[PDB]
Symmetry: C4
Subunit: 353 residues, 4 copies
């Protein structure tokens, strides 16, 4: 039985080695965060508008000014190859078939260049800064290979304390490789090419990356730039003031700070304050979750684990199936609440509980 | 032990094939809706008025201006024949013996005409519009056979995603038939009698039926007209403005949209705004649930699953028993809260929790 | 292990026949009421006052102007003889040894006269009116035998729907008798002594007893009169206006109306509005429950099941033990919150949660 | 697996005799208090500040004007020797190695003098007053041996009703001794040295110790003085008015009054009202709990059971490990919420839930 996202999670758990499933499903510390990410959606219920002609419905919507099939994206997730062979490509091709963007992780198992050469969809690149020079190299590589949008993830200044991984002594699968860091030379002896080599031999990001550094990144990247990992309207607003074209409210799927608020708690405020695109992720599993966020003003919702369950359970086809179910889910929900055009969603369709 | 509605649910589950019980009991998606429908009643508790003479109590009340034994009705439910042989007739006869109306579903297993010929009680007809022409035929048939009231159900523009049915591959019992669509001719070749035949060969309602279409229905039906499936005081008010004589607040027993609010959440507001009869259903199981709704202003409460448990467990007699228990329940509750005349109920007997 | 009331409940359940334990412990319908009666106490927590000299503490307090050892009473409960032989006397003697009043039920197994002859403590009489003439007889009997206070119970206009009793086909123990109705003659033929005989052959109270009837009772009884079963400050106030010397807020231990509010919900309001003694019962098990009610203004707390567990488990000694534990509990609590004199309790020691 | 405090609790439960584990883990009566102490932390979630340079973080902070490695302390707990041999010394040495103070209990198994001679860290002394003369002796002894701070615990005027201890008939381990009361002479015959001997032969504190007595203690002790066990901003303020240099909000880890509020409920108010150091304990297990309290204004958090689990499970090394984990936990949390300097914490990093 594969009728919803949970069904794929169940199948994924049956097919993945425990260590890998825990890497995927686990959250930080007590996992109160991942639970809160799910529970917060119950803070809203629907107030359908009846007797509305919903015979013709549209899920098409502009994201950052560019039209796509539906307000969804497959968000950046690292080590996809540990879930399914060539996982990054499977996800990218499924997203492309569905008419939505795919975001490649800095910690992907397929390189920026290789993906761009094997997929003609709308590819976005998610950046993690470990070393400024190396980051610049990846950004320029993404630019030259056709990536349309750059996403800076800011919520992993230090690694999250995921206790399942500690219990399992989780180690990156030996057959896997952080492809984007491949060929970053060596032998070079001197400050950089030493301070860099040392940085790469460390599983820690550049914790000093601040607003000033964002300005640097803004000048380097000429296209759309989003800042991911924000949990306040104030930070979202500052990002816009610093040059960002939009933001992605997110708590990294409860994988970094267990007691972090859910981004849903500051969605409406961020939308009202910034006046710019506010995308969101963390906890989305049902079409109703997605519609609630869109009704509150979100430009689009990025999927993390939802599509990864499809990938881990049935590869590319599994991802296609999850996207198909979610699209039919969103469509069904729109019809049921009396909002035929997804772009017409508003808070008026919701009741705060 | 058959002392309340739950006892009949338990017996019904023991006597019905799993597939059928799931069709009856199931809700949309995660079934958070059916649970919420039950839980919402705990938002109110009673503040009895003591030392009131309750030696003489009355449950008699006018519904749409017409007096009936108690403010209850057996609401429209499809495929009753799958629960018990000639289920529609059993329910109708039980309702008639209890002195309350029975609402026949468009998806009933006994035709509009056959029921009217075999039951002299107050029969109401619930309409689903798949094809305008066919709907008109049913409405006129109900009119000519003595049905007093017409109920338009508006919350199934598209089919609900009930996962139990998907797991069981639920298929309408072969010995059952949507009798009201019987004899709708064929062979006829041309636009209609083709666009119609195609519509009937589709398990989907007319999703375009809107306010304009309601105006059409209002002109076709000369007697009392109610719109069912509303979940907002605004929609209820618009229905009255468009000609309706009252409304039925309802989320279809949590079978259509899992995250829909419970109609109890907008009952008081709808009563205050419309100033017209506001009936309600969804989640009612105990007399206290019913009394709470009546105290908040509801004109009457329609029973869905409650009487179906009686039907599935013990046929017509089972329905008689459930109605008898509920009547004694309501009566007992009125005595206990110090409101001898059911028509005297008000919010003053309740405490918001 | 017998260190609190719950320990006695556990022992009582082990020693009583299931039917009897269910009669004792059971509540109306779903028993959400008895649960709410317990849960409501968690709506308040303590804010102790430190560095207060609590070396000398006093639990002595006036109830209706008369001093007693502590602000507790053993409330009226019927069929005590079904829990332990001569249960009414055991409870009365334990209450007397503890220095608190005992309230005899109209449905006691020991007569008004017999108890008064075998116990010299402060005896109160709880009245149920089935027949006016018979009620007058009992009231006069209580008056002539030394009962100091009369309590009219108003919350059983009709019998509660206790489903455990229905499942067990509960029948008053054959070796038991409603002693207070003994010798009410017969053979007499005519209106009364016929309308009366019929009333006694019915397990139903006089549902017509109203405010006018209370006035009649007020004129018949010359001493302190309390009205029990109130659940609103308005009713409590009316009782005072009609002549009552105080009231007992109560939902009959969740045995009559499952969805009734807990009396704790209207305690403070009743105290402020009436300006007269407001006693309370329903749900009290821990000394902290009792102290919370007293802090909110209650004159005294009546125990129902708490002391009955002591009785059912270990007879008179069991009741003595429960009262001893509760007294030590209240004393300990007073010391811990910094209120050495129980009469000094106020809302300032509480925090609303 | 020893990755957090709970892991040490699990190991401690496996290594300690049941009686001892219950003495350690148990709470008063129903233990709703210890549960509330944990649950209250979920009333706040984090709103991280992104793009803040957190490459250089500092946990150093002044407590009562004196700098220490982090805003933590190992609080006073009695009978540590029952958990691990020379438990008091193990805890003291671990605290000293971590750069934080250790508070010796009046009911310690190692004397004030012996500890001071074997540990050169910052030692605090917690006082319980059973007899004024004896208390003075201990205070002077602590003064002469180098203890920097005196803590008066005021929440054990009477002993808490811990039912686990009652069930286990808990008796202070025979190989243990209340060392601080050793050599308090005898044979002396007359008022004191009789009223004193009797006081020592009683497991009850001086319940008369009030504000006047605090003034006496204030004049006796020349250094920093804190009052522990407060649960209101009003009491905290009075302590400052009476001469205290700060307070410790605490409910004694839910071991004294089950229905006591959690000190977290009055932390912000106490900080705002007193304008003096407000330390706190009760319920702290995760670094996030600690950071929430510090963000609300707490000067420091005292650990009770957290470090005792380390002690009971693995002795001194276990305590070292727990402190190491908590420090890394706090550090990680600071980085994640964007507050590199622990002294910069404020309510702005929190969201009330
Ligand atoms: C297995 C896994 C790996 C992840 N790796 C990254 C990453 O490399 N880059 C990034 O920006 N976010 C990363 N994320 C976070 C996601 O982008 C997204 O915020 C999160 O999955 C949203 O929550 P959800 O899983 O409930 O949908 C990861 C999430 C998961 C589940
Ligand atoms: C088995 C089943 C079939 C139903 N079929 C119909 C239908 O044909 N027409 C309609 O208007 N409502 C239909 N309903 C909805 C009911 O009219 C009513 O809204 C719902 O049962 C109320 O909730 P309750 O079941 O908790 O009482 C159906 C409900 C059930 C349980
Ligand atoms: C077994 C049982 C019999 C009772 N019988 C009577 C009665 O005869 N008269 C009356 O006034 N209340 C009666 N009560 C109600 C009590 O006076 C009291 O309101 C109730 O027990 C308080 O709640 P508690 O049981 O939680 O303490 C009865 C309660 C129990 C538990
Ligand atoms: C086993 C045990 C013994 C204790 N003994 C004392 C004591 O002698 N003096 C004192 O001031 N507090 C005493 N306390 C209370 C602690 O100082 C502290 O308030 C409490 O442990 C904080 O809660 P926590 O255990 O959740 O951290 C004790 C606590 C425990 C767990």
């Amino acid at each position: 039985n594969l009728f919803n996202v949970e069904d794929y999670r169940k199948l994924a758990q049956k097919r993945l080695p425990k260590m890998v499933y825990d890497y995927l499903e686990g959250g930080a510390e007590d996992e109160y965060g991942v639970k809160h990410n799910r529970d917060v959606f119950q803070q809203w219920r629907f107030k359908p508008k009846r007797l509305v002609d919903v015979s013709r419905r549209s899920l098409q919507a502009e994201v950052l000014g560019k039209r796509q099939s539906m307000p969804l994206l497959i968000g950046p997730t690292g080590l996809n190859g540990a879930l399914w062979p060539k996982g990054d490509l499977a996800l990218a091709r499924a997203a492309t078939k569905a008419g939505i963007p795919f975001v490649l992780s800095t910690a992907s198992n397929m390189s920026i260049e290789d993906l761009a050469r094997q997929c003609d969809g709308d590819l976005w690149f998610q950046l993690y800064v470990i070393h400024r020079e190396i980051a610049q190299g990846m950004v320029l590589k993404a630019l030259h290979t056709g990536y349309t949008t750059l996403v800076l993830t800011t919520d992993v200044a230090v690694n999250g304390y995921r206790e399942r991984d500690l219990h399992n002594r989780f180690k990156i699968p030996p057959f896997l490789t952080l492809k984007n860091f491949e060929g970053i030379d060596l032998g070079k002896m001197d400050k950089a090419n030493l301070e860099m080599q040392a940085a790469l031999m460390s599983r820690q990001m550049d914790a000093s990356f601040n607003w000033e550094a964002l300005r640097w990144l803004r000048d380097l990247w000429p296209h759309k730039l989003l800042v991911k990992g924000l949990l306040s309207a104030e930070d979202a607003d500052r990002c816009i003031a610093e040059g960002a074209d939009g933001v992605i409210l997110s708590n990294h799927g409860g994988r970094q700070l267990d007691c972090a608020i859910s981004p849903m708690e500051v969605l409406a405020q961020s939308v009202a304050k910034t006046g710019k695109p506010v995308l969101i992720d963390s906890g989305f599993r049902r079409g109703s979750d997605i519609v609630k966020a869109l009704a509150l003003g979100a430009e689009a919702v990025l999927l993390g684990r939802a599509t990864l369950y499809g990938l881990a359970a049935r590869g590319e086809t599994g991802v296609d199936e999850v996207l198909t179910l979610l699209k039919a889910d969103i469509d069904r929900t729109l019809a049921q609440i009396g909002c035929p055009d997804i772009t017409s969603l508003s808070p008026d369709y919701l009741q705060n509980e």
